[PDB]
Design a protein around this ligand. Structure first.
Ligand code: CHT
Ligand code: CHT
Ligand code: CHT
Ligand code: CHT
Ligand code: CHT
Ligand code: CHT
Ligand code: CHT
Length: 311
């Protein structure tokens, strides 16, 4: 809905001039969309820009006041003629790098030899977050890289690999909502269920989020590191109680012999018993270590080689 002007080539740049004024920011001109920056120079290729459509960065010329406004920035792709690529699905394009973005018409730069598939949202920006493609989940980076002032938006929209936190994010991370961990393999596919990574087991479940703490999977209990997710084995002191986890990770219940020493792990909860306890109508005594007293006396009461109380 911008009309009555014309494109002008001047000083190795391209402008759109109407009634003697230069177009700035976003314009829809004769069925195509262009962006002319803060002083009129038409952009080409990859651009990280304030979102169009509100009116505050739209249909504006450089003789008009430019409002203060807070708008998220997103990645957009423009042709070499300045026309916005109005894609809402996906398209293979030159990879955005440090040397092919923020360019204007008239500027020379190398087209990336590397091409990648970029995904787009319904408003022609590069899509971020979770997408489902041909039977798998992929994560498109919502965030760029930080480095003490050094924000680089380049990784946004790119396929994530490896260990990745899914933050709630608009302009910035919302550090009040949860940010679960995921693991994407070498092609970006989200892993589920049990996976061994850097020598340790993790459980990602059906939804892909990395489990922490206690988790019941296929009829057995496992303990994943409360912070780091890695699966524990052996004896573990958790919540002021000992538990014994097999080499497979599965929690033990009932009687368990470590070397010569017997321990009793509570039938349901799995916690190691100490003191006097009953099992199937028999009395047994475990020391503070968990070790079953056998062939000896305890507070006047004697116990046989099975550890059972004898009258
Ligand atoms: C990761 N999923 C998209 C599979 C679900 C959680 O948002
Ligand atoms: C959960 N991670 C393994 C990704 C981080 C460990 O600190
Ligand atoms: C041994 N795990 C149970 C940890 C995974 C493979 O079955
Ligand atoms: C039963 N466990 C203690 C093993 C898990 C949390 O209740
Ligand atoms: C069961 N004993 C009688 C052995 C001790 C009391 O708990
Ligand atoms: C770990 N415990 C203290 C339960 C016994 C030593 O194996
Ligand atoms: C003999 N115990 C009762 C100690 C355990 C194995 O049966």
């Amino acid at each position: 809905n911008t009309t009555g002007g014309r494109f002008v080539d001047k000083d190795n740049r391209k402008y759109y001039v109407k009634d003697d004024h230069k177009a700035i920011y976003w314009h829809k001109i004769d069925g195509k969309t262009y962006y002319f920056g803060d002083i009129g120079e038409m952009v080409v290729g990859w651009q990280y820009l304030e979102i169009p459509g509100t009116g505050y960065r739209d249909n504006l010329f450089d003789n008009q006041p430019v409002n203060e406004i807070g708008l998220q920035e997103k990645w957009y792709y423009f042709g070499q003629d300045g026309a916005l690529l109005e894609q809402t699905d996906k398209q293979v394009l030159e990879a955005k790098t440090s040397e092919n973005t923020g360019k204007v018409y008239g500027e020379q730069y190398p087209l990336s030899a590397e091409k990648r598939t970029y995904y787009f949202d319904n408003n022609y920006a590069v899509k971020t977050g979770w997408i489902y493609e041909d039977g798998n989940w992929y994560y498109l980076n919502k965030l760029g890289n930080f480095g003490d002032d050094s924000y680089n938006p380049l990784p946004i929209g790119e396929v994530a690999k490896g260990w990745t936190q899914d933050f709630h994010v608009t302009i910035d991370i919302d550090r009040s909502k949860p940010a679960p961990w995921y693991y994407l393999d070498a092609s970006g596919k989200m892993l589920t269920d049990w996976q061994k990574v850097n020598g340790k087991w993790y459980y990602f479940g059906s939804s892909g989020s990395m489990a922490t703490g206690w988790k019941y999977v296929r009829g057995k209990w496992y303990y994943l590191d409360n912070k780091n997710g890695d699966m524990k084995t052996g004896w573990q002191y958790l919540g002021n109680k000992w538990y014994y986890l097999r080499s497979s990770g599965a929690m033990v219940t009932g009687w368990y012999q470590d070397g010569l020493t017997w321990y009793y792990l509570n039938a349901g909860n799995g916690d190691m018993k100490t003191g006097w306890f009953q099992v199937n109508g028999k009395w047994y005594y475990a020391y503070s270590s968990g070790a079953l007293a056998v062939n000896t006396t305890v507070d006047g009461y004697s116990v046989n080689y099975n550890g059972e109380w004898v009258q």
